[PDB]
């Protein structure tokens, strides 16, 4: 029971830990340009895709290779918990 | 002042005796009295030498002397409804003492309480001393177990019992020690889990038979 | 002229005086406005007064009830939270009924608590009682065991007689006279 | 199946909350029903439900023309819904007033496209919500609704 | 004048009068305004009313019904919740309307509540019922259980006369003479 | 004169002063505007007016009825918690309406509560009642039992002549005379 | 004069000097302004009329209905609350038709309501009916049975003539001559 | 007037007053107002009351509690944090319980936890109590021992005779005199 | 001073639960005969769990040291 309540802590855990860089990095991005639009006044709507394209693809450029081994290393201990 | 004054409002709870050897002592009658005289003279407001003595504690404190300078002796307790003159209570069918040995007794014990003038020793049979604790038992209508052995009685009071079987054993029990003591008959009042309180069988072949009393009972399911 | 205790509430202080004036030492309770009260002794009887402070254990402690610990401002309520509530309220009811009996000073009832039973498939457990009593002496207090067990059987769902248990005792002897002053 | 539905329908207010569904006017409420269906299969679980099974032919035996009892089942359509709304009570809650303060942050400059900066955060703060009440109260309920054998009698009656 | 008590309200101050003139010491109630009521008493029943104070556990604590813990003003409430606010209201009302018969004085009605039922499809148990009453005194109280079983048994769902129980006593002497002031 | 009681309204302070001059004392209402009632007796009257204070219970409570702890104005209501005032506005009427009888002074009437038996697939239980009354003296209270029994048992769904308990007594002498001043 | 009552109603003042005026003491009307009314009776009559508004326990409740906690002034309202409003009004219209008859001063009609048949498996009972009334004097009150219970019969689906009971009974004495002020 | 302990409070200053007082060294208690009490002795008796303070470990810790560890103030609430809290209050009400006893002063009660049983489907484990108790000296403490056996098997579930534990003791001798002031 | 055995992992997995064992150590006065004093800590210690045995427990008590009541003294040079 107890490794039961572990591992679904767990799963939460590395979600909300894994899409933390990428949301927070498509956040101050999302902002600075809007505060941009604040002081020279500006009315288009689409404009902070084209930063946010560039952000979320480059923040999952640098931490490709790292989250293969959070994946690989929680993967292969919840086997072992299930199986032994 | 005086000490009979320096103590409470009424004087009718406490006794002021003089002693042989100069000193004065006091006479309480319970514990909760004893700490109420023991305050007046451990606080100082008298100049003289006092004690506070008490039935209880001065009924112990000669018991200490007596197995030390009379060791196998057969006794039960001293009373002090009157204490110019307490009555020793000794056992008749178990001393070997004659009547110019009691006397040296008598003097011996007067010198270890200087407020005393005289102990009157008397005799109490040994049966008389066991018969109203059984006869006490049962008019209550208590289980017990009777152990008859050399040298005292004992009487012993187990099973599951009710709340009522426990107050009016304890208020016997209490009552009976105040009379005679605990010297040659004791009770055993003691609650285990079992239905059948203190009596135990075991059934073959032609009926139930009476075990002996022993110490592993067997534990009930009901 | 010295101090034991200080910053006492108002029933805390009469305990303390009722304690020390049993003993034969006087003290005096003294005011001190959003302070609470304080307490003094003389001289020569606080060598005492410690003694009796610390043998008894004052000041008391305020007393604990099993409601205060699953307090109603929480937004939730466990089942485990509604029940513990439920019971102290009902063995905390039966102890203001019990004193008003003839010549029961005081009394104390406790409940067996059971939150765990309904929560699996397992069958409810039986329900236990037991009570604490001081009478007025002079009362033969052995008939009056089976009327606080007559009037704590049907109280509650089912219970048995052997379940409750009721052991109760008179009161000590009284204090009436007055402690009396140091003299020197 | 009564304790199931109520966690499903708990993720599918999770999950709406969030975004991920509205595509249609799922992936996160199937977590929850396969976590809810070991945690009631370890302890208990097809013991009773065996014998709620084994109780049936206790009180409806065929040749005796049993029937699902009626009146009762009204309000079964009622009974999950509001297990479910106040299951998941706290995260709809939370994700309010995110939306509120993300309103008034608007309206001190309109030029920000507040509808699509709030839908990166929220399920950030619906995961990271449910992180702290995941562990002590959800694995409680449902043994807490799951039905027993007791309550047979009324739900199944018998004409004859 | 000793002050034994003060900030007791009105309800609380004519107990404490109605103890201490019993023992042949008077008290004195004086009013404060908002700061509620006070009791003195002299310095030689100074001893003696700190002595009952403890003994009769004065000040009497406020009666505790079951509805206090349940409150209305809830949100929402549970069916736990709700039959023990009905019962609650059941019990009171049961012994104002015991008041009211020929020689009754005071009563103190119980029922046994329902806990497990209100989450579980077990069918209930039989209610069992309990009362205390006071009757005033010269008045035949071995024939007046008759009627208070009477009353009260189809008062309810179905109760049987094994599973009612009355306790019920004569009231105490009166005090109707002055205590009279400590001369010296 | 030394003051009882203060704060009361004009229903307690019409029963304080119609039981105290029911043993001999006097009493006098003095008003206060929106600060209540009060109530003074003499000296020598203070020392038995404390005790029969605490004896009755005095001041009253005001009397309890089941629609108040379930109030109108929730957003929700239950189905429990609409059977309780249907059942709390019947038990009124049936008790207004029994005054208006040949000889009857007071009446009160309890109504059966069943709440659990709605939601289940059990078939309803048969529901009880019970009433009591106080007639004038000079009546045969014997014969009147029979048409309380016979208003009571179809004002219902389906109620026995033996569900129904009627108990039923004559009013105490009546107070005329003045209590009188002590003389001193 | 001593006062007794006051903030009263128009119809609570005229019921408290109905019920003085029989005993043969006296009272006064006074008048308060925007308060309302006050009864204030002699000096001499004043433990009497205490005494009296304790037993008839004066002043009068207002006459509950049911339709009065089921208020149509809700956006939603239950078929519970609906039919507990039809038959709260249709049990006023009989007695209001009830009064029109020949000899009939006062009359109050009960009809049993139905509540769990909405929503149990059960078809609805039969209706159960019952009437009280007071005739003028100098009627064979016996023959009037039968036209309460004709009327009563079909004015509903389908009730028996053992449903229905009616209870009446003839008018008190006359009160006409005054009652007389007390020789001071 | 070599000060050995400062900043301490009420009652840990009256513990470390109590443990020299009894070993013939006097002391003195300073108060500082804020900043708590001090206190200091005398220069020969410095060597024998560090001594004193070292083996008896003082001043003294306060005592811990099972529900202080799992405060109420959380947010959450698991249920083992909901059955600790329940039975360390149980075990603070039955300490409180026991010292009302006649003759006991103090008393300590302890009561088995349980973790593992109550979230399996494994059964809960029977129950075990042990207590400590000061008794009055005088007593005969080997009759003592029933009443707390019968008072403590029956406030719980399903406990047996054998797995309750009672050690008692009687008090120690009385200080009653002044130590004494070290004349050089 | 008082020591329990911290087994906590036991409802990881589906094996029952150890035993629970506890060790005990304690100064007593001196002049008390400290021999018949270790089965009143074991009886008391014994039932304030679920199930121990008696050699489950271990008490080591010991009497305390002799006291030093007279000053140390000043040195000269």
């Known amino acids: 029971m107890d490794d039961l309540v572990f591992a679904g802590n767990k799963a939460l855990y590395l979600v909300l830990i894994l899409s933390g860089w990428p949301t927070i990095v498509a956040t101050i991005i999302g902002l600075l340009v809007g505060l941009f639009q604040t002081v020279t006044q500006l009315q288009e709507q689409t404009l902070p895709f084209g930063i946010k394209l560039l952000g979320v693809c480059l923040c999952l450029f640098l931490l490709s290779g790292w989250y293969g081994e959070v994946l690989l290393s929680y993967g292969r201990q919840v086997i072992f918990l299930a199986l032994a | 002042a005086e000490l009979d004054s320096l103590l409470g409002q009424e004087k009718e709870r406490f006794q002021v005796l003089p002693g042989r050897d100069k000193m004065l002592y006091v006479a309480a009658q319970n514990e909760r009295d004893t700490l109420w005289a023991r305050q007046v003279l451990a606080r100082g407001d008298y100049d003289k030498n006092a004690?506070?003595?008490?039935?209880?504690e001065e009924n112990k404190r000669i018991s200490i002397w007596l197995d030390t300078y009379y060791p196998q002796l057969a006794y039960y307790?001293?009373?002090?409804?009157?204490?110019?003159?307490?009555?020793?209570?000794?056992?008749?069918?178990?001393?070997?003492?004659?009547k110019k040995e009691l006397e040296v007794?008598?003097?011996?014990?007067?010198?270890?309480?200087?407020?005393?003038?005289?102990?009157?020793?008397?005799?109490?049979?040994?049966?008389?001393?066991?018969?109203?604790?059984?006869?006490?038992?049962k008019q209550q209508a208590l289980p017990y177990s009777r152990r008859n052995h050399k040298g005292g009685v004992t009487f012993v009071i187990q099973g599951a019992l009710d709340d009522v079987e426990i107050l009016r054993a304890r208020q016997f029990v209490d009552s009976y020690y105040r009379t005679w003591g605990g010297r040659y008959v004791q009770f055993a009042i003691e609650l285990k889990d079992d239905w059948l309180k203190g009596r135990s069988f075991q059934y073959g072949a032609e009926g139930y038979i009476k075990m002996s009393p022993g110490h592993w009972y067997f534990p009930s399911p009901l | 002229d010295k101090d034991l205790l200080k910053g006492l509430d108002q029933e805390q202080a009469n305990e303390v005086i009722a304690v020390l004036q049993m003993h034969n030492i006087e003290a005096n309770k003294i005011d001190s406005g959003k302070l609470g009260y304080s307490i003094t002794v003389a001289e020569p009887d606080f060598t005492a007064a410690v003694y009796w402070i610390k043998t008894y254990q004052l000041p008391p402690r305020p007393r604990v009830e099993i409601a205060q610990m699953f307090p109603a401002d929480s937004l939730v309520s466990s089942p485990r939270a509604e029940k513990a509530r439920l019971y102290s309220a009902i063995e905390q009811r039966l102890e203001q009924s019990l004193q008003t009996m003839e010549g029961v000073l005081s009394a104390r009832v406790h409940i067996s608590y059971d939150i765990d039973a309904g929560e699996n498939g397992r069958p409810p457990k039986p329900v236990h009682l037991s009570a604490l009593a001081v009478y007025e002496r002079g009362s033969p207090l052995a008939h009056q065991i089976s009327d606080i067990k007559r009037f704590?059987?049907?109280?509650?769902?089912?219970?048995?007689?052997?379940?409750?248990?009721?052991?109760?005792?008179?009161?000590?002897?009284?204090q009436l006279q007055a402690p009396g002053t140091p003299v020197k | 199946s009564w304790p199931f539905w109520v966690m499903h329908a708990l993720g599918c207010i999770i999950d709406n909350q969030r975004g991920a569904t509205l595509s249609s006017s799922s992936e996160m409420a199937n977590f929850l029903n396969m976590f809810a269906a070991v945690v009631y299969l370890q302890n208990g679980g097809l013991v009773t439900m065996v014998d709620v099974l084994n109780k049936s032919y206790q009180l409806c035996d065929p040749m005796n023309e049993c029937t699902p009892s009626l009146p009762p089942l009204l309000?079964?359509?009622?009974?999950?819904?509001?297990?479910?709304?106040?299951?998941?009570?706290?995260?709809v809650l939370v994700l309010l007033l995110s939306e509120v303060f993300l309103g008034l942050l608007?309206?001190?400059?309109?030029?920000?496209?507040?509808?699509?900066?709030?839908?990166?955060?929220?399920?950030?703060?619906?995961?990271?919500?449910?992180?702290?009440?995941?562990?002590?109260?959800?694995?409680?309920?449902?043994?807490?609704?799951?039905?027993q054998a007791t309550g047979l009698s009324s739900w199944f009656y018998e004409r004859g």
Not at chain 2, 51 to 56: A, K, L, P, S
Not at chain 4, 110 to 126: C, D, H, R
């Open chain 3, 152 to 174: 704590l059987k049907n109280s509650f769902a089912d219970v048995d007689y052997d379940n409750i248990s009721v052991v109760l005792s008179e009161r000590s002897d009284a």
């Open chain 4, 75 to 91: 309000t079964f359509i009622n009974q999950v819904a509001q297990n479910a709304l106040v299951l998941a009570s706290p995260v």
């Open chain 2, 51 to 56: 004690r506070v003595i008490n039935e209880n």
């Open chain 4, 106 to 147: 608007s309206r001190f400059a309109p030029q920000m496209n507040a509808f699509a900066i709030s839908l990166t955060v929220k399920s950030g703060i619906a995961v990271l919500i449910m992180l702290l009440y995941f562990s002590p109260v959800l694995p409680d309920n449902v043994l807490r609704l799951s039905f």
């Open chain 2, 105 to 137: 007794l008598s003097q011996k014990l007067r010198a270890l309480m200087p407020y005393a003038d005289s102990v009157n020793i008397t005799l109490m049979d040994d049966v008389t001393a066991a018969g109203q604790a059984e006869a006490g038992l």
């Open chain 2, 77 to 98: 307790r001293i009373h002090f409804d009157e204490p110019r003159k307490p009555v020793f209570w000794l056992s008749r069918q178990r001393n070997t003492m004659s």
